[PDB]
From a paper:
In class A β-lactamases, a conserved structural element called the omega loop5 constitutes a wall at the active site that shapes the binding cavity. PenL (NCBI reference sequence: YP_439646.1) is highly conserved in pathogenic Burkholderia species, including Burkholderia pseudomallei, Burkholderia mallei, and Burkholderia cenocepacia. PenL has been used as a model in exploring various evolutionary paths to substrate spectrum extension through amino acid substitutions, deletions, and duplications. In this study, we demonstrate the extensive perturbation-absorbing capacity of the omega loop against TR mutations of various sizes, some of which are large enough to include the entire omega loop.
Residue numbers in the entry: 22 to 238, 240 to 252, 254 to 291
Amino acid sequence: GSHMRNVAAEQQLRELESTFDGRLGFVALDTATGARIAHRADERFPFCSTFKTMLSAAVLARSAGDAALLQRRIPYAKRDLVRYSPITEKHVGAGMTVAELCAATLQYSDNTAANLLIALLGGPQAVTAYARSIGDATFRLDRRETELNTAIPGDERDTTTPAAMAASVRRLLVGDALGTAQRAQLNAWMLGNKTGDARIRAGVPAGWRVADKTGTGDYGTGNDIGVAYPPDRAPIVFVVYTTMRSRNAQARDDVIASAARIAARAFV
């Protein structure tokens, strides 16, 4: 790629934002060169379910010094369920293993699974602490599911910036924040995501493998973060955050795919 292609990409991202009643936060980092395509990279956005990557990384980091942690079964009752728990709703009572909860929260965005893992780690503050430990000074998890998706304008609870999240995703999925086995497992879970077919995956070349985690919330908040693995190039980190001015707004898969498409064309 080149500086001029990246500049043009950034202009195209500004044009894309002008098509909807909201704002676009975007970073694509080419790990071949360290080059970045950015749009509103240092504005805070509500992360919604994209935090589940940070959450699962924290669990994996803990498992590195306690292999049997991943097999621990966590019980829970129906009364502990929250909205959007398609996997955990099927296993109330005896519950599920820690590994199963990670797969559920990453691949189906299961909310109760996330709450159980947040509890296991020591609460929302423990997830923020993990982020701090990997060099992320920006990420903050303040609430649990599903309140963390309120996406209220000016509310800094449960937010990060596209730049901070891209740096963290790079460290976790490509770099050395996790041990080899743990990085492989985090990638494996995210490669098998079921909720992201219309987002980053829809915008980048079909030949690229994508490990992603989506987020959707109030104010039409529509997010997707992850890494694309081209067959002939180094990995590219993608972070796409969008949110809208109206409470009646809905997330826009197409805008997220379009943003990724614009950047993919520049990193040649």
